[PDB]
Amino acid sequence: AGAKDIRSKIASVQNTQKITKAMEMVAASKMRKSQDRMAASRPYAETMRKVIGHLAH
Amino acid sequence: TYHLDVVSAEQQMFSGLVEKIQVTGSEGELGIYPGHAPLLTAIKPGMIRIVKQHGHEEFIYLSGGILEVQPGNVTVLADTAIRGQDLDEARAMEAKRKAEEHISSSHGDVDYAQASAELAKAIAQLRVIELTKK
Amino acid sequence: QLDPLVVGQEHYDTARGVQSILQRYQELKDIIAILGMDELSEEDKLVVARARKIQRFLSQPFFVAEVFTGSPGKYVSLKDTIRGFKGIMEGEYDHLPEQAFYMVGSIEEAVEKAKKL
Questions:
Q1: Domain that holds residue B4
Q2: Which residues form the signal peptide (chain B) (predicted)?
Q3: Residues B66 and B100 in one domain
C-alpha cells in the first residue's frame, strides 16, 4: 500500500537488521567458549587415537 | 629417556620426556624405566611420581584410570586426576572427615561399596599430600 | 579538489592513505568486538596501532577554544600536515605513545610532547 504502509515496512526491516546482528555477536561468543571445550577435549581424544594406534599392532 | 602423556576428559595433566615414574597399579604400586615391561593395566586410587631431568619430581593425584607403557610414548588415562598443588593437605584432611563420617553413616553392603570408594578417594589424597612435601 | 592534477600526487596519496587506513580500522573494530584482539594478526595490530595515532593527530587546538582547552592555539601549514601524516604512514614516529599526537599541533611538536609525556 501507500507511503504510510511502506514507511511501516521499512521499520520492520530495520528491526530485523538489529536482531540478526545481536545474534551474530552472541553466536560468536558461544563459538569461542565452545572452542575451549573442544581444545580441552582434543588432547584426551588424541591420546585415545594413539592408544588404538598401539592396539592395532 | 621416554615420553609420558597423562590426560583426563577435563584436561591434559602432563606431557613430556621423563626419566623415571612410580605409578599406581591393579595389584600394587609399580616402578617404570626406559624400556620397562610393555604392559597395560587398570589402576587403584593413588598417585604418580614424575621424576624429570635433573631429578625433579612432581606429584599427580590419580583417583581412577587405565595406563599403557608399551611404546616409548607411554600413557596414563585418568577417569579423574588432580594436579598436586590444586589439591591441598588441608583438603585431604577434610576428605578424611567425610570418609570417616560415611563409615559411621553406612550400614548395608551397597552403601558400604560407595563409602569404601569415598574412603579410598580420601586415603589416596591423604597419601599424595604427604608425598607432595618432598 | 582532492585530485592529482589539482593538489598534486603527494597530497593525493597521503589523503588516500589516511582514508584507506581509517576505513580498514573501522572494519577491524568489528572483529575486535565480535571476536576480540586475539583474532587480530600482527599486521592488523599494526594498522590498528597506526590508525589510533592517525585519528588523534587529526585533533588541533584552536585560538578561539583556548578558554576550553587552556592550551594556546596552533596554525599548521599544508606542507607540515602532509609531512606529518605521511610520516606516521611510513612508520617513522611509530614508537611514540598515541597520546603524544593528541591536540599537539604539527609532528615536530609531537616529538617534543613524547619526550616529556
A1: 1-87
A2: none
A3: no
Number of structural domains, chain C? Answer: 1
- Rounded Cα gap, residues B35 and B20, in angstroms: 11
Question: Residue B55 belongs to a domain with what CATH number?
Answer: 2.60.15.10
State residue C105 phi and psi, 5-degree precision: 125, -135
Whether C35 and A32 lie within 8 Å, measured CB to CB:
yes
Query: Chain C within 8 Å of A23 (Cβ-Cβ)?
Result: no
Tell me how close the Cα of A6 comes to any Cα of chain C, in angstroms: 31
Q: Which of C34, C39, C40 best tests the A interface by mutation, with the highest count of A CBs <10 A?
A: C34
Dihedral sign of CA atoms C35, C37, C41, C43 in order: positive
3-state secondary structure of C95: coil
SS3 category, C35? coil
- The CA-based diameter of chain C, rounded to the nearest angstrom, is 44
Least Cα distance to C17 among C47, C56, C45, C44 occurs for: C47
Helix (H) or strand (E) holding A18: helix A3-55
Spatial CA neighbour of B8 closest among B96, B86, B56, B76 = B76
Q: What was the experiment behind these coordinates?
A: cryo-EM
Nearest CB to B9; choose among A44, A50, A54 = A44
Q: How far is C23 from chain A (nearest CA, A)?
A: 20
User: Chains with ≥3 Cβ pairs under 8 A against A?
Assistant: B, C
Same domain, B9 and B61: yes
